[PDB]
Amino acid sequence: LNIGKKLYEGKTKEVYELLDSPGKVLLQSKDQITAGNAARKNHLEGKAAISNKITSCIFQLLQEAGIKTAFTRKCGETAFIAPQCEMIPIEWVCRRIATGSFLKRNPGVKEGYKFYPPKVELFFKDDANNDPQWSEEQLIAAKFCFAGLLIGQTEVDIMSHATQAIFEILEKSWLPQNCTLVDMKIEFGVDVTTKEIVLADVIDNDSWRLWPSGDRSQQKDKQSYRDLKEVTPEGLQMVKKNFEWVAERVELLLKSESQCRVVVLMGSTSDLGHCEKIKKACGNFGIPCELRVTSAHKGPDETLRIKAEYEGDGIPTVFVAVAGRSNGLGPVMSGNTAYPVISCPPLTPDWGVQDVWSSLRLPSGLGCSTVLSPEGSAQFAAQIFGLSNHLVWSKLRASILNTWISLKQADKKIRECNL
Amino acid sequence: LNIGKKLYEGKTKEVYELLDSPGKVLLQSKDQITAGNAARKNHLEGKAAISNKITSCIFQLLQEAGIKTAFTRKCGETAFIAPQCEMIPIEWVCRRIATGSFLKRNPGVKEGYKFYPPKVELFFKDDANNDPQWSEEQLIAAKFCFAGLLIGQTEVDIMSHATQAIFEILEKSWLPQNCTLVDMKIEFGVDVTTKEIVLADVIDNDSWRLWPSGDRSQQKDKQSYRDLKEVTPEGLQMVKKNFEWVAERVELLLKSESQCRVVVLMGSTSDLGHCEKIKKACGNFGIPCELRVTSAHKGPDETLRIKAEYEGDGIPTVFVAVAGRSNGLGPVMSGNTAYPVISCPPLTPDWGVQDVWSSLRLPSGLGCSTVLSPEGSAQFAAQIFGLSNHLVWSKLRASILNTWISLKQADKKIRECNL
Numbered sequence: 033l034n035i036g037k038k039l040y041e042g043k044t045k046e047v048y049e050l051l052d053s054p055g056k057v058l059l060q061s062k063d064q065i066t067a068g069n070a071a072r073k074n075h076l077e078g079k080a081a082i083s084n085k086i087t088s089c090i091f092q093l094l095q096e097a098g099i100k101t102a103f104t105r106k107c108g109e110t111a112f113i114a115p116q117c118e119m120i121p122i123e124w125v126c127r128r129i130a131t132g133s134f135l136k137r138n139p140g141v142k143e144g145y146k147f148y149p150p151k152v153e154l155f156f157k158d159d160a161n162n163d164p165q166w167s168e169e170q171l172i173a174a175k176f177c178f179a180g181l182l183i184g185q186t187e188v189d190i191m192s193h194a195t196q197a198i199f200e201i202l203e204k205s206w207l208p209q210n211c212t213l214v215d216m217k218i219e220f221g222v223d224v225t226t227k228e229i230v231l232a233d234v235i236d237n238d239s240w241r242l243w244p245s246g247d248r249s250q251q252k253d254k255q256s257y258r259d260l261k262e263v264t265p266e267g268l269q270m271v272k273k274n275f276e277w278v279a280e281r282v283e284l285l286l287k288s289e290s291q292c293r294v295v296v297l298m299g300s301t302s303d304l305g306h307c308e309k310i311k312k313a314c315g316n317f318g319i320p321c322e323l324r325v326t327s328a329h330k331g332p333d334e335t336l337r338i339k340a341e342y343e344g345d346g347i348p349t350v351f352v353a354v355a356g357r358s359n360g361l362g363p364v365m366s367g368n369t370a371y372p373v374i375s376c377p378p379l380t381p382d383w384g385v386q387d388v389w390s391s392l393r394l395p396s397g398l399g400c401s402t403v404l405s406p407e408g409s410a411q412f413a414a415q416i417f418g419l420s421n422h423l424v425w426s427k428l429r430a431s432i433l434n435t436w437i438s439l440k441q442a443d444k445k446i447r448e449c450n451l
Numbered sequence: 452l453n454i455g456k457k458l459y460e461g462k463t464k465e466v467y468e469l470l471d472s473p474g475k476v477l478l479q480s481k482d483q484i485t486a487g488n489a490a491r492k493n494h495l496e497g498k499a500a501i502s503n504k505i506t507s508c509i510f511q512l513l514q515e516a517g518i519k520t521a522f523t524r525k526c527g528e529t530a531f532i533a534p535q536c537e538m539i540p541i542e543w544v545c546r547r548i549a550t551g552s553f554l555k556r557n558p559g560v561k562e563g564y565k566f567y568p569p570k571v572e573l574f575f576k577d578d579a580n581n582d583p584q585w586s587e588e589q590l591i592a593a594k595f596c597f598a599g600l601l602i603g604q605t606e607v608d609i610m611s612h613a614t615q616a617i618f619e620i621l622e623k624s625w626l627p628q629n630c631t632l633v634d635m636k637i638e639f640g641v642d643v644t645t646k647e648i649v650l651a652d653v654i655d656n657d658s659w660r661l662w663p664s665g666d667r668s669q670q671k672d673k674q675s676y677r678d679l680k681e682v683t684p685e686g687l688q689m690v691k692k693n694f695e696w697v698a699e700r701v702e703l704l705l706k707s708e709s710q711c712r713v714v715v716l717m718g719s720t721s722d723l724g725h726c727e728k729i730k731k732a733c734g735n736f737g738i739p740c741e742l743r744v745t746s747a748h749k750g751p752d753e754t755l756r757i758k759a760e761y762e763g764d765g766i767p768t769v770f771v772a773v774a775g776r777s778n779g780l781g782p783v784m785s786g787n788t789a790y791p792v793i794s795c796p797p798l799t800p801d802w803g804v805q806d807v808w809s810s811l812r813l814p815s816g817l818g819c820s821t822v823l824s825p826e827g828s829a830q831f832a833a834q835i836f837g838l839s840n841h842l843v844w845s846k847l848r849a850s851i852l853n854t855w856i857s858l859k860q861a862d863k864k865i866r867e868c869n870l
């Protein structure tokens with residue numbers, strides 16, 4: 033590992049150039065904890081390893097969901113490799129629950145006020161003035177430029193939407209551990225190579241407020257250190273145990289709590305191309321997808337036996353029925369399983385207007401749903417599993433963001449061809 | 452006129468009970484101008500008449516548009532009758548252009564920054580603390596109750612949307628006088644009889660910032676008095692002339708700058724019911740609407756002569772063609788006039804799926820549009836005239852608000868039937 037010059041150093045991290053890696057840097061954590069802009073600073077042994085472990089797990093989680101993130105890989109106990117960014121000097125905060133500075137700036141609001149949707153705020157980075165709140169209008173008027181990207185209305189709107197999405201993903205991911213994510217702070221930078229705005233810096237135990245069972249008095253985050261009247265050695269051991277508590281649970285956010293499976297049943301091997309599109313699209317949400325050939329019309333006995341194989345092994349299953357012309361496979365399956373059935377018929381413009389009604393108009397006592405897009409039927413199957421699986425949910429959530437970002441970028445492009 | 456007790460008195464107005472009018476009060480203006488929470492106060496002769504005249508014109512304008520407003524009628528030179536309200540102690544501000552307190556609270560924003568859409572802000576009324584900015588969260592948490600109405604999320608969302616709509620109407624109404632409405636402040640109350648939230652207090656020359664030709668140095672509003680280093684008698688005569696300038700122009704906001712007409716051409720007197728619905732709906736936007744009987748099929752010579760009558764008298768006209776079955780009246784009219792033509796065919800479920808295509812699929816060189824709803828065709832005709840007529844525009848704008856308010860009220864009702 034070919035380490036170059038120390039680029040900068042701050043309160044908790046040293047950033048080094050990597051001579052064998054163009055556009056990449058090494059972020060080495062220090063055994064330092066800090067708070068405020070006064071003398072609250074301490075050595076804390078093992079903090080560097082805890083910060084590194086949390087950020088490395090959280091960045092891998094957000095990256096596997098599809099959030100664009102400045103993270104390459106973990107590099108031992110106390111560092112990580114990242115794409116080099118020109119950091120935007122704004123703290124982006126997201127709140128589910130009103131506490132901390134929100135109450136000070138909004139006297140009359142009580143602790144516990146819930147934000148639907150989560151509240152996003154901006155703070156300009158400046159220790160001299162204790163990080164003052166900025167409006168979107170102030171950030172636009174600053175006309176900041178980083179690695180050649182002017183930070184305008186489009187870029188601010190993107191960081192704002194991304195902050196909400198990142199919060200919701202981390203919020204949903206902590207829920208299975210019976211922890212309430214109250215709020216968080218993140219920072220973005222411009223990747224010096226790609227010129228993309230990406231989540232950067234770290235997300236660690238100083239970034240958020242984490243309340244087991246929603247109970248503030250059980251707070252496990254750095255607020256436990258900020259709240260101390262006086263820092264004693266007995267006080268720092270409590271803080272360290274809180275950081276250890278989070279370090280011991282954070283890797284479980286990468287694990288699937290519940291199993292998911294899509295079974296695509298096709299009446300004919302001529303509709304294989306259409307079923308390959310469903311299977312591929314399921315792969316994008318990390319949901320295993322099996323293809324099976326069975327006809328309701330010509331082998332209804334075999335359809336029910338295949339159904340029984342998937343009903344009988346304890347794995348939650350969504351069936352997707354692909355039947356051309358008069359669809360009996362969706363209906364028959366729908367009538368004989370408690371699991372959901374989606375008809376995704378391979379309609380063409382020739383007879384599709386006529387064929388679709390055999391999926392849509394069903395006798396009473398049948399729940400069978402219809403989705404015409406094959407990518408759509410995978411997404412709907414994912415949305416169903418997202419109710420139980422935070423990993424699938426997070427891919428859906430990040431995909432809503434990324435698609436929205438794509439529209440903003442295409443509008444920005446075509447707007448330049450308006451002069 | 453049976454005047455009762457003086458209910459309250461402030462810096463500029465005395466409010467009196469009316470013994471012959473239940474739930475109504477008389478707001479008598481005083482010849483006083485004021486600014487800030489210090490000694491800036493002055494007698495100004497004729498100010499009471501100028502304030503009364505402006506508020507009376509502005510309230511009549513907003514009321515004729517369809518904005519719910521605490522105004523009954525003008526009552527001589529210096530008073531007006533209003534429904535009595537329990538006033539909500541919030542100043543609602545709307546901004547098109549960043550100036551004044553927006554720049555102080557957002558250092559870095561330059562004078563002239565434009566808000567798309569117009570920015571709404573709240574200020575809590577308290578002279579002791581110079582009227583501090585409140586968040587929507589602070590107003591909700593105050594749990595204010597006025598004439599029995601709890602001010603909750605629904606009520607705050609309504610005042611916020613109403614503030615934007617009122618600003619946009621006044622903004623559009625000043626445009627024909629080549630005046631830029633920069634920003635404004637309004638207050639709402641609860642009508643003690645109806646229990647509706649309504650625009651109340653006044654809107655006068657102290658309520659807004661008015662720049663002729665967009666030029667701040669020509670400001671005609673009360674900012675001209677606020678800006679004086681020292682108040683001299685020569686200084687007050689300039690302020691008075693600015694107030695007179697606005698008083699002399701404000702009545703022109705009630706006058707139509709451009710004439711509007713809808714001509715509904717029907718192929719058959721059996722479609723008269725359908726044409727009566729278009730005419731009634733046109734009446735709601737204040738647009739005269741004539742009915743005429745002509746067939747393209749059986750009297751095309753007469754169709755063209757009737758067309759010529761309306762093309763030839765210099766009144767801007769939208770033609771609405773009502774033809775059952777094979778619509779030739781829309782197309783023929785569309786091909787022979789430069790004025791817009793709307794086909795509004797009287798479709799029923801029997802043959803409407805078949806008949807509609809004769810309105811929709813036209814030879815090249817025909818602009819003829821289709822609107823199936825008869826109320827819809829009137830609204831579309833209004834939207835066309837709204838590009839030229841601020842009065843029509845304002846009815847459309849207020850109708851978007853009122854419809855949105857209706858949805859919030861129906862959601863609030865059905866939500867109570869969710870327990």
Ligand SMILES: Nc1ncnc2c1ncn2[C@@H]1O[C@H](COP(=O)(O)OP(=O)(O)NP(=O)(O)O)[C@@H](O)[C@H]1O
Pocket residue numbers: 040041042043044045046047057059102114115116117118119157221232233234
């Ligand atoms: N991917 C990245 N590329 C380049 N610089 C980065 C990246 N991630 C973080 N940094 C910077 O690394 C520096 C050192 O981090 P740290 O020691 O935590 O600083 P700090 O004292 O918190 N300074 P600051 O964040 O500016 O208030 C920070 O100033 C970050 O801007």
Ligand SMILES: Nc1ncnc2c1ncn2[C@@H]1O[C@H](COP(=O)(O)OP(=O)(O)NP(=O)(O)O)[C@@H](O)[C@H]1O
Pocket residue numbers: 459460461462463464465466476478521533534535536537538576640651652653
């Ligand atoms: N329709 C109304 N019904 C009842 N009271 C009203 C109505 N419109 C205005 N008022 C009240 O009339 C009072 C007298 O007005 P004014 O003299 O302008 O007061 P002020 O000194 O500006 N006081 P304030 O608005 O409370 O800061 C105000 O306090 C308003 O709340």
Ligand SMILES: Nc1c(C(=O)N[C@@H](CC(=O)O)C(=O)O)ncn1[C@@H]1O[C@H](COP(=O)(O)O)[C@@H](O)[C@H]1O
Pocket residue numbers: 043066067068069123125131132133134215216217238239240241254258
């Ligand atoms: N961690 C930080 C910081 C921040 O600068 N923190 C450090 C400074 C440093 O990391 O070196 C500190 O002084 O404690 N700013 C916001 N937040 C987080 O943001 C949400 C809201 O915080 P609030 O604005 O209520 O204080 C909560 O989750 C904080 O942890």
Ligand SMILES: Nc1c(C(=O)N[C@@H](CC(=O)O)C(=O)O)ncn1[C@@H]1O[C@H](COP(=O)(O)O)[C@@H](O)[C@H]1O
Pocket residue numbers: 462485486487488542544550551552553634635636657658659660673677
């Ligand atoms: N007129 C007032 C008031 C207000 O309280 N005015 C008076 C008090 C009084 O009327 O007795 C004064 O002190 O001048 N607050 C906001 N505005 C209007 O609101 C927009 C924004 O004003 P900003 O917040 O920039 O000062 C601009 O159009 C003001 O005229």
Ligand SMILES: [Mg+2]
Pocket residue numbers: 123155163
């Ligand atoms: Mg901060």
Ligand SMILES: [Mg+2]
Pocket residue numbers: 042233
């Ligand atoms: Mg930092």
Ligand SMILES: [Mg+2]
Pocket residue numbers: 542574582
């Ligand atoms: Mg004020």
Ligand SMILES: [Mg+2]
Pocket residue numbers: 461652
């Ligand atoms: Mg007043």
